Amino acid sequence: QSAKYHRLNLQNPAAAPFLESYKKAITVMLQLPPSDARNWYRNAFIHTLDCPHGNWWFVVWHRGYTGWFERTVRELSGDPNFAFPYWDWTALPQVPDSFFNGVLDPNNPAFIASYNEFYSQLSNPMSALWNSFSTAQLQQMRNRGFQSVNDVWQAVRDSPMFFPRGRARTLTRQNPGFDATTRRAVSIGTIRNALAPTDFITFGSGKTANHSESATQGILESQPHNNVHNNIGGFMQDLLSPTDPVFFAHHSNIDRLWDVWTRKQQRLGLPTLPTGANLPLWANEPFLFFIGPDGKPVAKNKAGDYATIGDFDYNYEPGSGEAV
Ligand SMILES: [Cu+2]
Ligand SMILES: [Cu+2]
Ligand SMILES: [Cu+2]
Ligand SMILES: [Cu+2]
Ligand SMILES: [Cu+2]
């Protein structure tokens, strides 16, 4: 658990400068040309293109994506100590009041206001990106049902995934609280249920052949993760969710709950990952779309590279977890 960087509770007074650094980076990334892969919308589209939902690649893909984006925020904030604070929704079952301030709020006029402007600004860059894809990357797009960039845009338009100014979230500063179901989903009882499994698949959601396929889900994915996404509403209810800065605070917390689970398993001398023939099936899954803090494609392009915190070199201030 020794590490250079420290993911703190966003309610920790020592986290406050990191939330100001996050606002500085968001402003930079909204101002970068969408030819730069660290542009705010370019970053969100990595999620649309490659995120697994409803399978055993859930926690590990999100560990990869959050750790790379953490480096990008560190770089573009000029804050060399930056680490993503976590939203402990078990302790704070509401959108944090701090995420309604400045560019932490995706209704802020610094954000693209309309689908029309979004398409205008991102269409040529996303076509250029498509035209650059390797054989391997085009196979990932085929596995996801995308034959061209315009199939991605059809999904963006028809879902819909983009929300205009005033609708970027459903929850508001005045009424930021979760509904009864989502309050239960983030309750200490449900979190303890989420941590109880003693094998990776039951913890982290069901095995599939490729990470664009849907399977049975674990508690961590199906209850606190999914219910929080949908109760926030707007961007957070669909696959351009990382448009909302709170996405990374939500995922800092999910990743903390994984760290809690791994340490619980280690204490009991039980496996922390899939075992036997399942281990290479899981570890060898291609993750081909991550962007480093220099805006270049990353070398670490398989799920197994992200099994541990590893090179990302962060630890957690302890939060809501198992009964001691
Ligand atoms: Cu330190
Ligand atoms: Cu996701
Ligand atoms: Cu630098
Ligand atoms: Cu620099
Ligand atoms: Cu999520």
Author numbering: 34 to 357
Paste lines from the article.
Crystals of the vsTyr core domain belong to the space group C2 containing two monomers per asymmetric unit. A second dataset was therefore collected from a vsTyr crystal soaked with CuSO4 for 15 min (1.64 Å), resulting in considerably improved metal site occupancy. Crystal soaking led to the appearance of anomalous density peaks on the protein surface, but outside the active site, that could be interpreted as additional Cu2+-binding sites. These additional binding sites are most likely not of any physiological relevance, since their affinities for Cu2+ are expected to be low, and none of them has to date been observed in homologous enzymes. The final models contain all amino acids of the crystallized construct, except for the C-terminal two (unsoaked) and three amino acids (soaked) in chains B, respectively.
It does not require a caddie protein for copper ion incorporation, which makes it similar to eukaryotic tyrosinases.
